[model samples]
Target chain A: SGFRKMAFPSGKVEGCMVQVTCGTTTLNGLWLDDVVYCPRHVICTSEDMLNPNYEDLLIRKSNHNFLVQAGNVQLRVIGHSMQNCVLKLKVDTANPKTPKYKFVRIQPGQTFSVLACYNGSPSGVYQCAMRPNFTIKGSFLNGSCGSVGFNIDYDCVSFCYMHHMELPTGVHAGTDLEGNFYGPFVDRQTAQAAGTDTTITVNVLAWLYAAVINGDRWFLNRFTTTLNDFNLVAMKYNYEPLTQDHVDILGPLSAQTGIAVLDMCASLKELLQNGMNGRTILGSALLEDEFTPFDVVRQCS
Target chain B: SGFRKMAFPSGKVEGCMVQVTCGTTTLNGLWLDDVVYCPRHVICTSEDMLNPNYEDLLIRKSNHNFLVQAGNVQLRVIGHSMQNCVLKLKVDTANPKTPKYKFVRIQPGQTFSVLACYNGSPSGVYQCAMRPNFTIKGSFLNGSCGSVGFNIDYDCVSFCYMHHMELPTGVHAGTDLEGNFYGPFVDRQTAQAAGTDTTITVNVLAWLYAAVINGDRWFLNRFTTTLNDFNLVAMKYNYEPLTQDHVDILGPLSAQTGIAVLDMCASLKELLQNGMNGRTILGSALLEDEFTPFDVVRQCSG
Candidate 1:
């Protein structure tokens, strides 16, 4: 009384091809044995010759989410007796005389997916697994399905999670937690909270002032060591220092102001090594800090 | 007998203001003592009251290369007795209710220059002195003379001489000669020709290969020393490393390619310090070079 109860037609089923129309073109499918396999254009059904009970022998289109230039369309067979039934899908083209067909042997409860190109336009579908910030060029079409669909799944398309991180002046940090790079925090507390162990917390101006205090070796060594540690961390985390274009993209109103923290440290180190005076650094206001003799002496030689 | 031979007018007669029209605007200028000081509109010629010889008394616009919004306009008087003659220039504005005038006392052959805003449109005129690559935003006007010009010299508007230098791969160099920065050459000879004393000669790939050979310190030290020397030179010459935008501006077909030489050195230093193997560097094809065990051994253990 299950699928085995369905009866088949006796004798070789000759001249049992059915013609179905989709849009303006007609698709020819075969009705062999006890199964009627039709093209994706129309649905087909079969009846048991002995029991006289009807059963669907068709391939159904399901889970079609192709709204634009590219998406996916899933196809599966229905009816208990439609197992191992071959379904034909015509690949529509501008020249209807040369029609290509894709055949899938689909069973009940089994889905076969393909990429749908909507509105007769094709798009470059990329796998956004590694590079999430990649840019796509071209316009997307608008429709459920195109004239044809490619034999590819839709899982390749993913949303980009790359975003910008803002930081305050006089601080630099980055982290690589869970295999993704993040942070560039301005403060120690915030960077620590974001899973970054190393954070640069030196006031560059104050350090410069202390370093140039009669060529103080202690302050210079301390500053150079801090910079070296910061540089090591930057290299480890693969932090990209901001460029002018990045700053311009952030816009003038942004508080972060395109400060290349690594470049700045490198430059300051070189400048200090070259015996640059503290007055010039202070005058340029590279960093704002109040300095007293006691503070200078304690932080210097 | 040259300029002193000119006749003087009896200004005790008083009331000698000549009205001159410039594009529907009337400007009143005084004709006092021995000079007929008219505004910079209609050129006024004055005959010596005693000798009856004609001499140009008006402020004639000269060297007027102001075809667009911002350029220089020069004005001078021609008469011998025009020395100390007050020439009036009206600063035109959209508001016709108030008229502003700038008076300059000039001698014959003495030229006064100002920034001309042509076609009633004003533009930012900057001195291209220290910063030759500075940018200006706005449309330039089209005309010889605007309604007005600022009292600034034309010498302030100078031409920009900043240009780009190209280099090939496996090269990192810069030079500062004659008070200007130049060069990023591919070879030592070319950089030397450009007056740069020090040039980086080591192929990064070859050095990296030598460095990764059994944790060899000699090759690493040599490479690091070369980089240090290059960095010091770059710092000395104030060479700005090319960013991504600079590369993009140079376009895709450019041979130089945007190589941040300083940053590359820094990265290589850190990577070698962290014990990164040469396989990754070689695999990436960062540089093309032939390596031999003999070459590697000699370069290593320096």
Candidate 2:
């Protein structure tokens, strides 16, 4: 016999509750907002689906829980699966000829995540399905099948999101290193006008705050390491940091936001109205109990 | 227990047959033109596999010979151990930083082809192997560890090759739409001119030819649909078709070329000397091949 009918509705959705059926088991009422007022979760809006460009959707299945996160993009899934199976991924785009496929193994009881593409304008649809295998026989770790859950090679664009673009390979008007990506400089004159362009510094604000909220040591480590290298080059040529006011804006929103969620649009507006410069004090209520990102990622089911 | 021994070889090499051993059973002598003159078959020449962007190499256990092809890129492999097992894929390029990888599953006794990337200059090597798992128990498809193979997300750029660039994403300068990719229309105006802009059309010609020889129904279907869309776009914008003599050069060279193996250099020369046109003749030579892509993919196995 082949796979029985199964659906893995990614993240929380409206108008209905999601049921994930694997073998003799079925999970219901799993949305975070259901049990508690988890401000971090929401239903995916239609506006999120209308455009192809999407934030990365990362899903992890460990023991009895499925954790899903979409960076700045609405999320949902219409898919099927079978017992003792793992999901398969593909990218369907305007060019029907070439459909991109990725195989991200989710071993039993393992915590794994894969980055979905969200690169260019109206990027493309990233879909997933479980492989059809009736008799499952994989080795185990700690009495459970070993896990194959990891996400890499992602462009840490705004937050810890997958931007789909390969790290910059070409030379830039400002920086001169391969794998260094900097944008929003506007034009050549903008580069000449500042210590470091205001545009680049603004972009860094979300990135820094996201790293703090997620407490992703890996992302932060890579972030600081790369940024350090990048800044070294920029500073050698005088690359500037974000103005102090913008830094304050990030501090408030970061404290106000939850994991995988950012109040970027509001902060952008604040930056615009306040002339987007540096220097001090417009803070808000922040998250009280600070759990290091290491604990959240490590211990979370 | 875990896997006994598995190795995935990916690099720039020449003039030697590579051997892959999975458990006790091993298959050897898998290459193009092994038997009769399968018009679709051709030995991978140094010129073919010499480049960095190689075709995806697929291996299956239920046989005595190992077959390898990466379209226009040069390829071979070596390894040992196990039984009823197959080595999948990986992309090892010049720059290890961005190695493009492909995982093609091989089911028991099935034939499937995957696209290869060849978009950039010579890239680093692409390679793959099952992780070192001591305790191995995978659900068998046909009960005897028998298997079928698979490939993924490659451009099949040159006669089923791998060139590391972006997949077909946007519009072209001369063609106006998707399929009609041409460059340096640097001749007489009308937005579509002459001689060797050298960037655009070179990429499309191989993409078109490879799909034809491989009888890639999926790729061809998409090619025509998009080509039709593009032609409508050109008509709307008053774009021009390629001139005649250019079509002749492609026909002769195309006939001479093998699947996943085209004389792009020679074809390029002909296009330049002939002033590049005859956009129609080049179109039909595409579909006349009745060879089912499935069969071409299947029999090459045994």
Candidate 3:
């Protein structure tokens, strides 16, 4: 050995082959300062490094599967393979029989990601793993085992807000009256939309139609708006801040029709069809012939 | 020479089969004063005298038949089969087939008045005529006619008032608030009756029951004085002059049920029956599992 080989040579090296039993030095998680790859029966390799991606991958999996956000959502599973290692990830979409796959080229110590995508509806199972296509230098046995997954999940529902009465009258915009819940609509049209005397048959019918449409995808409603029907709106990754934008949208639509308003004595079911036999409003000949009459005093202005 | 002896009559007489032409005079109607006796083919007698009773008798006949008053009304055709005359009258009632008959003692111009008695419901027919069993005297044309009637007519409806919603808050006796169209009540009980908050299921059901009861004939309703479901009340006559009485009635009823009061937002139909499948409010499952809710905001002071 010419002059004693300094037994304390430190600092990193890749793919340590044999165990040099003499040198024993500690190395940090990310190989920062010094490390004496003390040669032992254990051949230090990429498997030697702490796989941060493994924990990260599992977190993404759990969150998407269990803790999910609203609206059309998809889950992304991440994975990384060693140098010249090709990892394949597969996700089932519309069909279970045919699963789609995506490949990631994790070049030696290089962090690469593979997505175990997701689909809504009757959800299909997903599978992700690092299967080596070549000589896996990052593994002692064919390829390093790394996998993460979730049962695809995400749901959405449409809604409707139906009101049966008219807004208080004579009180102009911003002038609050009894049950004036809408509170100061921006203008007369918007004000009138809430104030539209729903006693009229046509206005009532409009409200009914508005309810039906709000319970749909586009929410093509005449009366209620997105805010009126849905409390939450989708943000970049989560729900957005609440606003009266729904009222703003609906109030104008109300003005476009320009219908008069009436008191709230109107019934909602009088318009909708009832499936139950007697439960349906069965009108009688007497009721039909008789006019439900009332009198109001005229103060001779 | 057989008819040469002309006779001087004492007073009036009828059915003079013999010719005794003597004197004739003009009289208005009931000649209570004048006494002109003439012996002729037409003898000047009470029969020839204008009997005001004849017309008066006919009027009573027509009145009960055409111009009837409240209650059972009947018409009578009073007839007099005099020594030479007859009269007749008729009114329809219970039995049109077999009309009941009555006889009047208008004998020899005796002042008599008979009622055209009437009966309500399944009415019967009545008939009156001067059919003299001994009328060999008042012969040939015996079908006389007479009548009387009333022309006064103006109708009124003694309506019972009804309301859709409960009375608004803070409005007490004689205090009119919005939609307090029925004016004020006499006391607090009636005021509270309409004010009872009925939006909750139990209170609503209670209100419903109240409405149905108020609508009944007896209107034994604790809240309303009359059939309160219709919003019109019948007093002794024309709508019980909008009084504080109805309010007095309802306010007490409202106080009995331990519920907070609000304006009339109570529905009448809920009290009637459920027309809707959801609301027809058929309570099911188990009563033990149910928890009926009510509201109240009372002050300890007063």
Give the per-residue lDDT of model 2 (tens digit) for B1-302: 11000111111111111222333322221122121000110112224334312222122332233233333443332321221121222212222121243323321112122111111111111111111111111111111111111222232111112111111111112111111122332112123222311122322343345334433322321112233443343344323232233344345334534422124333323333452232322222211121122222221111
Model 3 lDDT, full chain set: 0.18
- Grade the docking of candidate 1: incorrect
Best by lDDT: 1
| Candidate 3: tens digits of C-alpha lDDT, residues A1-301 | 0000000000001111111111131111110012111111111233433332333333333211221111232312122122211111121222221112222222111111111111111111111111111111110011101111111111111000001112232111111111121232421222243322112222222332232222311212233324322223122112222234323323433453342111111122211222223321111110010000100000000
Q: Model 2, which residues run further than 4 Å from truth?
A: A1-114, A117-159, A162-198, A201-301, B1-159, B162-197, B201-302
TM-score of 2: 0.19
TM-score for candidate 3: 0.14
* Residue A264 of model 3, lDDT score: 11
lDDT of 2: 0.22
Q: In model 2, state the lDDT of residue B267.
A: 38
- TM-scores across all candidates? 0.16, 0.19, 0.14
Tell me the tens digit of each residue's lDDT in model 2 across A1-301.
0110111111111111223222232222111222111111111122433331212212322222322222232223332121111221111112111112232333111111211111101101111111111011111111111111122222111111111111121112111011111232221112222122112333334433433442332222211223244344434422243334444544544454442212333332233334213232111111111112221222221
Off by over 4 Å in 1: A1-230, A233-265, A271-276, A281-301, B1-88, B91-302
* Model 3 C-alpha lDDT per residue in residues B74-126, reported as the tens digit of each score: 22222211211222112222222221222112211111110111111100011
Q: Point out the worst 10-residue segment of candidate 2 chain A by lDDT.
A: A1-10
lDDT of 1 by residue, B57-133 (tens): 23233322111111122222223222221233322212111112333322111111112122222211211111111
The two-chain DockQ for each candidate, comma-separated, is 0.01, 0.01, 0.00
